[PDB]
């Protein structure tokens, strides 16, 4: 009914809203999202520093 | 006089490893206060946390620091009260 | 079945002198400790079985010091860096925190942070104006010790009030 | 009968209470949870420390 | 008939008593204990120091 408002009111669930949007608005199978979640998202924290720096670098180089 | 008092203080009041009420009976106000401080130290050493701490890490230095701080402040307060 | 003992010895039962307590170093041992031990305070702790010789004591001390330095960033200093008393932390139910030195302890409680400029008003203010080396670290240690002590004493006061 | 009090009185079995909630409140099969618990039996010591540091970072990054 | 006395009299067999207690009083199959013992105990001595320190640490942190 209204995506932007729901996204704004519940920022913590941005990943959930992204997943729902991917499965319904885009055409991707729920199963592939499921096993992508269940599988390799393991590297944690020590690479979260590099992940943060990569996000800010991607913003800096975006043009 | 000073050596007599100091050696007697050591041997009679502080050298023994075991404190008692009869022990505090003999001395005066300052003697009673310091012997009750010795008793307080022994009580604290037998407290569950401090026994567990010594069994886990030994480290008598840390316990000495704590009890020495407590003893310094308490003797200061006691002298204040007497005066 | 009573059998009153009347034979308690505080240094026999409560605090037994270990090998590494009561052992005054020889000059060679002193030099070995000075050169080979990062933080000498870690020589004071003897966890588990006593090391057989001073080389093992030194190695164990260095391993413990490295582990504690590695642990400080997720340690109690960092954990308490947010709200010792806003969160109702009870230091009474705590392990002896032997390795903890104030280090990761910069107490910024989220909430209680209202308006919050990043630039200081003057060149004075800014940081803690102490001129001694190692400041902001021994100050942090004093602050963490004081926060732990005060929160625990508040908890003690509440418990004694309930008991009364 | 009353989940919050039982959890409060026995905080040590928080994992057990969560497992029960997963099986009965949610639809999660006991077998998948059981297999995951069987596979995640390598504590690795260092892995525990990295778990601590990642968890503290996630905690103070949550907002 | 009496677990504690038998445990006290023969301390060296504490592992055997634990295994028997697991396989009879607890519900774990003897086969899983057997093949756990076959495969798992490979690492030795050099990490036995680390294991010793871990045991004493777990005692120190027990509460």
From Swiss-Prot, chain B:
Give the source's domain of life in one word. Answer: Viruses
Q: Where in the cell is it found?
A: Virion; Host cell inner membrane
Which regions span the lipid bilayer?
A: 66-83
The cysteines covalently paired via disulfide bonds are none
Family the entry assigns: Belongs to the transglycosylase Slt family.
Q: What is known of its domains?
A: The N-terminus contains the transglycosylase activity (Potential). The C-terminus is essential for the viral DNA translocation into the host cytoplasm.
Q: How does it assemble?
A: Homotetramer. Interacts with gp15; after ejection the gp15-gp16 complex composed of a gp15 octamer and a gp16 tetramer probably binds both the viral DNA and the host inner membrane.
Q: According to its UniProt entry, what is the function of this protein? A: Component of the cylindrical core that assembles on the inner surface of the capsid during capsid formation and plays a role in viral DNA ejection into the host cell. The inner core is composed of stacked rings of gp14, gp15 and gp16 proteins. Following binding to the host cell surface, the internal core is diassembled and gp16 is ejected along with gp14 and gp15 into the infected cell. Gp16 probably inserts in the host inner membrane and remains associated with gp15.
Designated name of the protein:
Peptidoglycan transglycosylase gp16
Its organism's taxonomic lineage begins at:
Viruses, Duplodnaviria, Heunggongvirae, Uroviricota, Caudoviricetes
Whole-protein coverage range: 1072 to 1154 of 1318
């Amino acid at each position: 009914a209204d995506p932007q408002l729901i996204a704004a009111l519940y920022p913590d669930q941005a990943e959930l809203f992204l997943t729902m949007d991917m499965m319904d608005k885009q055409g991707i199978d729920p199963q592939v999202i499921l096993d992508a979640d269940r599988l390799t998202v393991k590297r944690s924290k020590e690479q979260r520093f590099e992940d943060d720096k990569a996000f800010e670098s991607a913003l800096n180089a975006s043009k | 006089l000073w050596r007599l008092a100091d050696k007697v203080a050591d041997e009679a009041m502080l050298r023994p490893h075991k404190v008692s009420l009869q022990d505090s009976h003999a001395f005066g106000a300052l003697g009673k206060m310091v012997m009750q401080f010795k008793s307080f130290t022994i009580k604290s050493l037998n407290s569950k946390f401090l026994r567990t701490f010594y069994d886990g890490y030994k480290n008598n230095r840390a316990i000495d620091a704590a009890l020495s701080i407590i003893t310094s402040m308490g003797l200061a307060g006691g002298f204040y009260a007497m005066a | 079945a009573g059998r009153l003992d009347n034979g308690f010895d505080v240094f026999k039962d409560t605090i037994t002198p270990t090998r590494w307590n009561s052992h005054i170093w020889t000059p060679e041992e002193l030099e070995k400790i000075r050169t080979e031990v990062k933080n000498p305070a870690y020589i004071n702790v003897v966890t588990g079985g006593s090391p057989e010789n001073l080389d093992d004591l030194i190695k164990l001390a260095n391993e413990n010091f490295e582990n504690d330095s590695r642990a400080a960033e997720a340690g109690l200093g960092a954990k308490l860096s947010a709200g010792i008393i806003g969160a109702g932390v009870d230091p009474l139910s705590y392990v002896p925190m032997v390795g903890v030195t104030g280090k990761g302890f910069k107490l910024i409680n989220k909430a209680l942070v209202v308006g919050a400029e990043s630039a200081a008003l003057n060149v004075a203010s800014e940081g803690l104006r102490t001129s001694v080396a190692g400041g902001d670290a021994d100050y942090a240690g004093a602050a963490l010790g004081g926060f732990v002590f005060g929160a625990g004493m508040s908890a003690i006061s509440d418990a004694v009030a309930a008991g009364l």
